[PDB]
């Protein structure tokens with residue numbers, strides 16, 4: 455079960471951890487992927503989760519895209535969690551480095567509300583280019599279900615906890 459998390463609010467918890475390693479340990483009902491609209495799991499959280507599934511997540515995702523077309527920025531889809539979780543909720547946060555609308559971060563987090571408990575990264579953080587402090591603020595103000603945030607970077611984790619309002 456979820457261990458070593460710091461409680462931020464009634465429903466938001468945070469831990470300095472590799473989300474892939476957290477997923478293998480807990481095998482949560484839902485692990486959130488920091489997806490793009492094409493479900494191309496190239497780098498960041500997506501690349502790491504996909505690599506831990508031995509590329510099964512990418513093969514499954516390519517079949518999903520062939521059938522359904524791309525996701526919307528702010529949107530999501532539920533696919534298999536493979537060896538990591540029961541399900542993977544692929545959530546598309548805005549990628550500021552791709553010139554996408556940061557104002558869509560709240561819509562992206564609203565997807566978490568369809569799941570009672572989730573293991574997740576901070577949306578639009580890392581290679582998506584948004585301010586992770588702002589992403590945690592939107593998470594806390596949008597997500598009402600139990601979210602266990604895994605922040606990979608130790609210095610970022612400390613900065614997020616120490617600056618949390």
Ligand SMILES: CC(=O)c1ccc(OCC(=O)O)cc1
Pocket residue numbers: 506507508510511536537
């Ligand atoms: C050994 C094992 O149980 C295993 C499970 C899943 C693996 O990749 C993900 C998938 O195939 O969907 C690889 C290995």
